[PDB]
Amino acid sequence: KSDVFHLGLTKNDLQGAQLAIVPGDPERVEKIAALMDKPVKLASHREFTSWRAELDGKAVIVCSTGIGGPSTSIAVEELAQLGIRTFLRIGTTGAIQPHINVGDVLVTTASVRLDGASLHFAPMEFPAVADFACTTALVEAAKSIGATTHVGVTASSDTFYPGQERYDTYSGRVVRRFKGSMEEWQAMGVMNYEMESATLLTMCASQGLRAGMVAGVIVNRTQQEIPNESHAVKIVVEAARRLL
Amino acid sequence: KSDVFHLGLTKNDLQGAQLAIVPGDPERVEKIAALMDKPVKLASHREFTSWRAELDGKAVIVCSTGIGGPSTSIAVEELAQLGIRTFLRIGTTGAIQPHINVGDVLVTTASVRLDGASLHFAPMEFPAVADFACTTALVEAAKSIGATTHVGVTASSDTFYPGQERYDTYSGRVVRRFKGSMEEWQAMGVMNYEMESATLLTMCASQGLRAGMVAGVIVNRTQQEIPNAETMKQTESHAVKIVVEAARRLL
Amino acid sequence: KSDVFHLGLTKNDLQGAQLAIVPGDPERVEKIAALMDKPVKLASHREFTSWRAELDGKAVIVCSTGIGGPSTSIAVEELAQLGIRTFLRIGTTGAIQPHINVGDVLVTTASVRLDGASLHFAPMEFPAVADFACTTALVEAAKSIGATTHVGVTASSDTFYPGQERYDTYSGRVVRRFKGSMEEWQAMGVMNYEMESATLLTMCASQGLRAGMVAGVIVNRTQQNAETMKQTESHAVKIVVEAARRLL
Amino acid sequence: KSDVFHLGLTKNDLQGAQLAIVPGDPERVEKIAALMDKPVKLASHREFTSWRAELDGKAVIVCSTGIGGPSTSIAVEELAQLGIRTFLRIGTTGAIQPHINVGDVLVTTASVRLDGASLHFAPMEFPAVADFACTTALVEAAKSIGATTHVGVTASSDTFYPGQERYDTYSGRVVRRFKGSMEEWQAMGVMNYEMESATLLTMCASQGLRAGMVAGVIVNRTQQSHAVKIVVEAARRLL
Amino acid sequence: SDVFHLGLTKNDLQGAQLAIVPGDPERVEKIAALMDKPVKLASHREFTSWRAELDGKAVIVCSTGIGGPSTSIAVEELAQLGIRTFLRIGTTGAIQPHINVGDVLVTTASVRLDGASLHFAPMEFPAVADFACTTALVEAAKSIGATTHVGVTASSDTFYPGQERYDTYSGRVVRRFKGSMEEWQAMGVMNYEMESATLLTMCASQGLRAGMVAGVIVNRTQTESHAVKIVVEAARRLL
Amino acid sequence: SKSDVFHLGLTKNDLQGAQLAIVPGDPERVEKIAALMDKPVKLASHREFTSWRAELDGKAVIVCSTGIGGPSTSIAVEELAQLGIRTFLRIGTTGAIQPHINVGDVLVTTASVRLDGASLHFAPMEFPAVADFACTTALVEAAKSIGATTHVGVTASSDTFYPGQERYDTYSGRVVRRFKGSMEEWQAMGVMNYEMESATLLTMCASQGLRAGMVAGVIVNRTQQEIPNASHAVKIVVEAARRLL
């Protein structure tokens, strides 16, 4: 039985949960839920793996989004239909600033919309902006956990390869739009690349839902293209505590 | 060992394979592989589950893409790095034409680019067009299997909900761009909506790779009666038979 | 006396025809019609010269479009009003791929929309895609006569000069949008430039009409001419008529 | 022998001509050239028919463009190559303003760019504007024969049907972009639709060439020789 | 007070139908003082307004401030009060090597590098000046013997990156504007300024008449009274 | 002294080491804002740019007007940056588009809908017109300290007062296609208000390593009327400035 098309969940499964932690990788869901009380597997369908847990006596959902705006848009919509009102994305990321180190934690205030799904919720003029309370929770959680943290703009790309101006590819080329784009974002102070935040932030900020975004830095793109975690995950859990 | 960042595969894993069948759902991969000879699981990481099998003596890969152009773009790029040159997508779809029945099979000649990843490969002016040999193989395979087939344009959307003009949602609203859009595509002859083809077709057609798209119709957005889980499974099985039969003609 | 504004034709003139072969140049119309049965002149108004003929007992029209999407859009609309449902464009062309040779035949599956008129029928996201049956008929006709055939994407430009990144012009300037564009299309596997197909294919694909396109390669810029063209003409003409046979 | 790819002309053939009158229809060329001295045919290829004549001792070209911006862009480019520096468009037109009557004369100051070829010369932000000298010459030539004249903006469409919001067609449909567009142009004071001026005006204004356009009103969808005299009279002021 | 920003009433205008609109509020009184019976009306924000008389007819002088946004407020509110003709007077640089300090530029139409023009008409619409206004300005410049250039102006929402200036805090110019000055130069664009695309589009699309004249103060490559004298003399011809 | 910048008529000396500016739209508001701080001194007045210096907790602060709109804002911000300013706090007036927002309420902008043109001269449309986290935090925390009725969220920032804010009580009575129905759309999307400077300010600062915040007082509620019939935000911007020195 399911009250939604993709996730395989009923409202009753959520046990009153109003906050979801949303990693990209289904395999990371169990790990994150294990940091909390009474973790229980709910469902696994396609790229959507969902567990329920408890935090200071209140139910919390952990559900994977898969890679990219499109699958993220499905998980967020269906979770919203089941009663989730606050979404915290926890990701991995490639830093594009020389002064950001592997293992650092980045909190996103807003995202460069290098995606398509965000346009399905708001025109390009609309900012892919995080909720102020969620952002505050993540920043304060980062202090509590103890991590080297940066706060600012992230570039959110519909591709891992040409949209992040990667050249370690089959074609070894990048379309005109993205030729020289990395150095452009770098000059504009953009911190990092990832793949889900523009859709998440736009769809939430334009629909009365709260969203925030934190990621662990797994490569620095000024040094290396292909990578080569816990601070970031402890932070998203600690932030959830503050948003309940 | 992996030659690539996401798929967990090496060139050795492919055993000379140059064609891949690419469903969206990782759960479909084993079922598709079971239509061929000596299938073996290769890897499963994130939404990317891959098997290898033989078709008429030759190695073939089956690898899931996940939902959307972004994860599709990863799978296609990484399979291309490993040596794949021909990609056949097999999907599920919602028909938007009144005359297309649940059970029908759709072969996509080109797609309306309502996605974002395609733009990362070619500007919007560029057609998200299928390879002629792949499309031919799918059409011919449909005739071999015995199916009611429709050939034409598909709308490929970055969303399941507002991009396909669904109002049955949390917010119940659809942004200006997509308001009244389903009626527009209907009048323009578009057969259906899905979520991966604009990215697949554009990225292949602009990089010297061959791609084709086939789907079974599991629902019609104009009809009143919504079929159950079973009826939809029979339709999937049919389109799946067609994609394997098509693959035989492209080796 | 006429059922349409420009073509100077009535439904009666078409004698039940449902297929039109559509070259750009009025001079080619008679030549194409001459490969078919019972050819006869119909009308000539501006760049629209029309002839009718017969293949396997069915009426066929041959009608020129002029240069560009604007005049093509007029001919296709008015032919559709008169009852045409399948359109086969036949052109001669220059190639942008180093391995497409003069004498080769190109069958277009879809076009890069570097025109304006296509946007009057569908938004840019919609593909300027040929009909499958038409494309199939063209490729099959090309094989039956042993042509060296290339099947793929064509770039369809509203200009002969800057849109095709030509600098041998009065100004010697190409606008930012088109600076470096030929190299980009080349890298993307685009076969050639022409000027009508984006409008033809988009307007047909978005209005329930069937369209296809074939062209003979008469020059190749990236490889650096009278008898070759006439020979190449005759061959792509042979193909479009043989394709038309299969589509009736 | 030809200096250009399409027109079939050499610089020599122009005999020092620097101004061209550019109608759409080849069948209008000789009629226009006949109003001037020593009219002689030069060439005829596809929709490009060219004649030379003389106006107060100076050679002048009359050359047809065919229908639409693409065809027009070829003719203007190749005439420019041959030495033409001033282009005067002569047309017949409908109108979309009820106060504009059949027999009135329209002088276009600039065009709404509903075409595609203009974008091959300048981005959309750039105005499809007529040369001030040409517009002046046309307006004052119109006044001098007592013509009723409207001066203002014309909408320049790559189509005759949906871009001019016509529904009396095969599909009976008009794409979202153009749905409600005629009422919008009407409200913004646009006089009329035609099909060539956005291309002509943009390619000339962005390339140092002078261009102008006059048209005679022959129909008006909102309602239930003169212009030819004007273009020729205007031409003699611009030599 | 009727209108929200200008603090003016219809009665304040005493039947005026024309306004001279400089950018700088401090230049308003200077322009008014050249005509008869100059009287201050109001001063709010960047909008300083004076009334004067020219050949026994009331005229307005009202500043716009810098940019399309504030210009759009002044023109709207003045039109609400009965103004139907707007003459912009500016000071300007130039991007063409042959255009000297002391030269006067008359703008036929503007490259729309602004945002506000889009709130009145889509980009396809030309930011074109009224023919009568442009004629009056050109004739008034002949009248006083000024060296006049007539043509296209690039109208930018910024003084710095939109005019491809690199002598700035960041030293960065966004992709869109990198190499843009050279492009405008090759296209024959005379100068940059910051209000004309909004002024011309908003007027040409609402039945209002607008023109623009500017004196050249500097040249990127290498008489404010003279331009002011022209704008006042042109105004006499437009009453 | 010869001005260090083209429009503002200021020298670096004039700033006395100031690194923060409070930036109202109206030049006539500058003196009023500077009067709430220590040692206020008029610096200059040119075009729409009136500038004062003052002191907060012994630190020099600039108050400078921007005029209406992105273009004039882009001049003031660029030239102040050149002079040494690294933090900008806009204080404005606004029309609320949500029904329960009262005239006099204080709105703090997290990011803006870019309905302007000048922002495109700094970053392509995909880039967010987002406020600095530290500045926004200071404004929110200052508003709480004085117990103001405050709303935090997205603002629509328009290049026009009339059609871009979907006002119909105008000379033409017309609104171009792009903006027809637009207010309802922003309302449904949770946008709080309209104003005219923040998209440019926020984009040009976030893309150039400058910190910016945005606060405005509501002067009309657009669900009720287009034009009103006829200082919490100000206390807040000064208190927030104190926290950012």
mmCIF file of N, CA and C in Angstrom, chain C residues 130-180:
data_model
loop_
_atom_site.group_PDB
_atom_site.id
_atom_site.type_symbol
_atom_site.label_atom_id
_atom_site.label_comp_id
_atom_site.label_asym_id
_atom_site.label_seq_id
_atom_site.Cartn_x
_atom_site.Cartn_y
_atom_site.Cartn_z
ATOM 1 N N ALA C 130 12.015 14.924 -39.132
ATOM 2 C CA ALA C 130 11.346 14.378 -40.298
ATOM 3 C C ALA C 130 10.441 13.209 -39.912
ATOM 4 N N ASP C 131 9.438 12.947 -40.743
ATOM 5 C CA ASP C 131 8.567 11.796 -40.559
ATOM 6 C C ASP C 131 9.333 10.498 -40.822
ATOM 7 N N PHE C 132 9.079 9.465 -40.016
ATOM 8 C CA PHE C 132 9.813 8.192 -40.097
ATOM 9 C C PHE C 132 9.602 7.473 -41.425
ATOM 10 N N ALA C 133 8.347 7.436 -41.865
ATOM 11 C CA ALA C 133 7.994 6.788 -43.151
ATOM 12 C C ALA C 133 8.699 7.466 -44.330
ATOM 13 N N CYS C 134 8.731 8.801 -44.318
ATOM 14 C CA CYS C 134 9.415 9.567 -45.359
ATOM 15 C C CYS C 134 10.906 9.302 -45.379
ATOM 16 N N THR C 135 11.526 9.389 -44.204
ATOM 17 C CA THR C 135 12.944 9.143 -44.074
ATOM 18 C C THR C 135 13.278 7.729 -44.546
ATOM 19 N N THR C 136 12.467 6.770 -44.111
ATOM 20 C CA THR C 136 12.630 5.369 -44.501
ATOM 21 C C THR C 136 12.582 5.248 -46.026
ATOM 22 N N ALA C 137 11.540 5.807 -46.644
ATOM 23 C CA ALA C 137 11.418 5.776 -48.107
ATOM 24 C C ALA C 137 12.629 6.394 -48.823
ATOM 25 N N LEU C 138 13.160 7.494 -48.296
ATOM 26 C CA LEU C 138 14.308 8.147 -48.920
ATOM 27 C C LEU C 138 15.574 7.312 -48.817
ATOM 28 N N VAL C 139 15.825 6.779 -47.626
ATOM 29 C CA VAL C 139 17.011 5.956 -47.408
ATOM 30 C C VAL C 139 16.911 4.700 -48.286
ATOM 31 N N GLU C 140 15.723 4.092 -48.339
ATOM 32 C CA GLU C 140 15.518 2.884 -49.139
ATOM 33 C C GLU C 140 15.673 3.146 -50.637
ATOM 34 N N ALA C 141 15.217 4.307 -51.105
ATOM 35 C CA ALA C 141 15.370 4.687 -52.520
ATOM 36 C C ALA C 141 16.834 4.921 -52.854
ATOM 37 N N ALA C 142 17.549 5.570 -51.934
ATOM 38 C CA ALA C 142 18.974 5.821 -52.104
ATOM 39 C C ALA C 142 19.780 4.519 -52.242
ATOM 40 N N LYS C 143 19.441 3.523 -51.426
ATOM 41 C CA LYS C 143 20.069 2.197 -51.488
ATOM 42 C C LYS C 143 19.797 1.485 -52.811
ATOM 43 N N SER C 144 18.555 1.570 -53.288
ATOM 44 C CA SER C 144 18.136 0.853 -54.496
ATOM 45 C C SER C 144 18.894 1.280 -55.748
ATOM 46 N N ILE C 145 19.518 2.459 -55.702
ATOM 47 C CA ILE C 145 20.303 2.962 -56.829
ATOM 48 C C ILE C 145 21.803 3.093 -56.502
ATOM 49 N N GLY C 146 22.199 2.588 -55.333
ATOM 50 C CA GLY C 146 23.602 2.525 -54.930
ATOM 51 C C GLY C 146 24.305 3.829 -54.582
ATOM 52 N N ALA C 147 23.548 4.846 -54.175
ATOM 53 C CA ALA C 147 24.138 6.111 -53.731
ATOM 54 C C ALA C 147 24.949 5.925 -52.448
ATOM 55 N N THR C 148 25.992 6.735 -52.282
ATOM 56 C CA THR C 148 26.684 6.825 -51.004
ATOM 57 C C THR C 148 25.859 7.793 -50.148
ATOM 58 N N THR C 149 25.182 7.246 -49.141
ATOM 59 C CA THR C 149 24.169 7.977 -48.372
ATOM 60 C C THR C 149 24.641 8.272 -46.951
ATOM 61 N N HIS C 150 24.395 9.506 -46.523
ATOM 62 C CA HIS C 150 24.584 9.923 -45.143
ATOM 63 C C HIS C 150 23.239 10.320 -44.570
ATOM 64 N N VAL C 151 22.932 9.782 -43.396
ATOM 65 C CA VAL C 151 21.653 9.991 -42.738
ATOM 66 C C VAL C 151 21.927 10.678 -41.402
ATOM 67 N N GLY C 152 21.328 11.845 -41.177
ATOM 68 C CA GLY C 152 21.623 12.575 -39.947
ATOM 69 C C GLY C 152 21.086 13.992 -39.906
ATOM 70 N N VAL C 153 21.755 14.829 -39.117
ATOM 71 C CA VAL C 153 21.283 16.181 -38.802
ATOM 72 C C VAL C 153 21.822 17.242 -39.771
ATOM 73 N N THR C 154 20.951 18.179 -40.129
ATOM 74 C CA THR C 154 21.265 19.258 -41.053
ATOM 75 C C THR C 154 21.038 20.566 -40.311
ATOM 76 N N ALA C 155 21.870 21.567 -40.572
ATOM 77 C CA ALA C 155 21.702 22.869 -39.938
ATOM 78 C C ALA C 155 20.966 23.795 -40.900
ATOM 79 N N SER C 156 19.869 24.385 -40.443
ATOM 80 C CA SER C 156 18.954 25.077 -41.336
ATOM 81 C C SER C 156 18.935 26.552 -40.969
ATOM 82 N N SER C 157 19.545 27.356 -41.832
ATOM 83 C CA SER C 157 19.869 28.745 -41.549
ATOM 84 C C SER C 157 18.989 29.749 -42.323
ATOM 85 N N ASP C 158 18.609 30.845 -41.666
ATOM 86 C CA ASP C 158 17.874 31.925 -42.336
ATOM 87 C C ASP C 158 18.759 32.785 -43.236
ATOM 88 N N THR C 159 20.062 32.539 -43.227
ATOM 89 C CA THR C 159 20.943 33.273 -44.127
ATOM 90 C C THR C 159 21.924 32.370 -44.846
ATOM 91 N N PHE C 160 22.322 32.823 -46.030
ATOM 92 C CA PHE C 160 23.368 32.179 -46.801
ATOM 93 C C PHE C 160 24.745 32.541 -46.257
ATOM 94 N N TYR C 161 24.887 33.743 -45.701
ATOM 95 C CA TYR C 161 26.214 34.216 -45.335
ATOM 96 C C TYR C 161 26.556 34.073 -43.839
ATOM 97 N N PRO C 162 26.128 35.018 -42.981
ATOM 98 C CA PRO C 162 26.635 34.929 -41.594
ATOM 99 C C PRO C 162 26.136 33.704 -40.830
ATOM 100 N N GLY C 163 24.925 33.234 -41.139
ATOM 101 C CA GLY C 163 24.374 32.041 -40.490
ATOM 102 C C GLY C 163 25.128 30.763 -40.815
ATOM 103 N N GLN C 164 25.871 30.785 -41.923
ATOM 104 C CA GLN C 164 26.713 29.668 -42.346
ATOM 105 C C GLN C 164 28.191 29.991 -42.093
ATOM 106 N N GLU C 165 28.402 31.014 -41.261
ATOM 107 C CA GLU C 165 29.714 31.545 -40.835
ATOM 108 C C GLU C 165 30.672 31.877 -41.982
ATOM 109 N N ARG C 166 30.114 32.494 -43.016
ATOM 110 C CA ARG C 166 30.895 33.048 -44.122
ATOM 111 C C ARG C 166 31.362 34.469 -43.849
ATOM 112 N N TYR C 167 32.672 34.675 -44.018
ATOM 113 C CA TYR C 167 33.328 35.959 -43.765
ATOM 114 C C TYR C 167 33.705 36.672 -45.066
ATOM 115 N N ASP C 168 33.489 36.001 -46.197
ATOM 116 C CA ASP C 168 33.771 36.574 -47.512
ATOM 117 C C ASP C 168 32.575 37.408 -47.974
ATOM 118 N N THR C 169 32.368 38.507 -47.254
ATOM 119 C CA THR C 169 31.179 39.327 -47.384
ATOM 120 C C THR C 169 31.566 40.787 -47.346
ATOM 121 N N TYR C 170 30.595 41.640 -47.666
ATOM 122 C CA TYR C 170 30.737 43.084 -47.594
ATOM 123 C C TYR C 170 31.340 43.553 -46.271
ATOM 124 N N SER C 171 30.753 43.117 -45.154
ATOM 125 C CA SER C 171 31.219 43.547 -43.834
ATOM 126 C C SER C 171 32.420 42.750 -43.308
ATOM 127 N N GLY C 172 32.494 41.472 -43.671
ATOM 128 C CA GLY C 172 33.548 40.586 -43.187
ATOM 129 C C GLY C 172 33.320 40.200 -41.733
ATOM 130 N N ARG C 173 32.142 40.550 -41.220
ATOM 131 C CA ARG C 173 31.786 40.358 -39.813
ATOM 132 C C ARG C 173 30.745 39.256 -39.694
ATOM 133 N N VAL C 174 30.836 38.476 -38.620
ATOM 134 C CA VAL C 174 29.801 37.528 -38.230
ATOM 135 C C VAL C 174 29.436 37.851 -36.790
ATOM 136 N N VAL C 175 28.143 38.027 -36.548
ATOM 137 C CA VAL C 175 27.600 38.307 -35.215
ATOM 138 C C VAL C 175 27.991 37.231 -34.174
ATOM 139 N N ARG C 176 28.133 37.658 -32.921
ATOM 140 C CA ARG C 176 28.603 36.804 -31.846
ATOM 141 C C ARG C 176 27.980 35.411 -31.859
ATOM 142 N N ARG C 177 26.664 35.352 -32.048
ATOM 143 C CA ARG C 177 25.927 34.092 -32.027
ATOM 144 C C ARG C 177 26.508 33.043 -32.985
ATOM 145 N N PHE C 178 26.987 33.511 -34.135
ATOM 146 C CA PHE C 178 27.483 32.622 -35.183
ATOM 147 C C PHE C 178 29.008 32.530 -35.301
ATOM 148 N N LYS C 179 29.737 33.378 -34.571
ATOM 149 C CA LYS C 179 31.202 33.271 -34.542
ATOM 150 C C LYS C 179 31.598 31.919 -33.924
ATOM 151 N N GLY C 180 32.309 31.097 -34.692
ATOM 152 C CA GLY C 180 32.756 29.782 -34.225
ATOM 153 C C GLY C 180 31.702 28.695 -34.309
#
